[PDB]
Amino acid sequence: WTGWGPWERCTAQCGGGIQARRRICENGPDCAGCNVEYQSCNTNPCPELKKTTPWTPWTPVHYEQRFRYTCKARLADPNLLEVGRQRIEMRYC
Amino acid sequence: FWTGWGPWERCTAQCGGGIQARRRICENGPDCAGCNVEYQSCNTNPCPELKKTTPWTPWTPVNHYEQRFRYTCKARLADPNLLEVGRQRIEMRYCSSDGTSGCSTGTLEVLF
């Protein structure tokens, strides 16, 4: 066996991944041991990415009020977090 | 000599790519002519788009009809515990004696 190679690219930036190192056994078809080794990488929990919903329209209570929420997700990419459309529910008085 | 291969065991992740491991044992030997553990990909399907609903806003009149609002938080994750909705943030304002003024009629401009 040759010297073990450096650990390659980690799969994910956070929340668990795998990192690989490899080696080659020159002039040997079946050598002693494994040519490839794996390890866990970036085992830190992913940051709690957050996005805010749009404000609701102003409605009277003379005071007028409106509301918004925040969508919190443990993600490695903000593009994987999205806020859906506004749902209006109406009934008569 | 190597013994029979073991089961593929457990996938690393539920979705988005993982590794499954199976093993064997070199009987009466420290160094057999192979690798004791074998890997294969598992659960390469993309993770589902989980959706959670925000709490409803209080019912409010329109002008007689009453309305309320909510949104949906969508995230591609393998675990629902990693998606949550934050606290409701309320912003108010004063409409004063006009009932409108800055709330609805903006800046009243009169030309004399």
Residue numbers in the entry:
A (entry chain A): 656 to 716, 724 to 755
B (entry chain B): 655 to 717, 724 to 772
From the paper:
Semaphorin-5A (Sema5A) is a bifunctional guidance cue exerting attractive and inhibitory effects on neuronal growth through the interaction with heparan sulfate (HS) and chondroitin sulfate (CS) glycosaminoglycans (GAGs), respectively. TSRs are a unique feature of Sema5s and enable interactions with heparan sulfate (HS) and chondroitin sulfate (CS) glycosaminoglycan (GAG) chains linked to the protein core of proteoglycans. We determined four Sema5ATSR3-4 crystal structures to high resolution (1.56–2.72 Å); apo state and complexes with nitrate, sulfate, and the heparin disaccharide mimetic sucrose octasulfate (SOS). Sema5ATSR3-4 is a rod-like dimer; superposition of the various structures indicates TSR3-TSR4 inter-domain angle differences, which may contribute conformational flexibility to the Sema5A ectodomain.
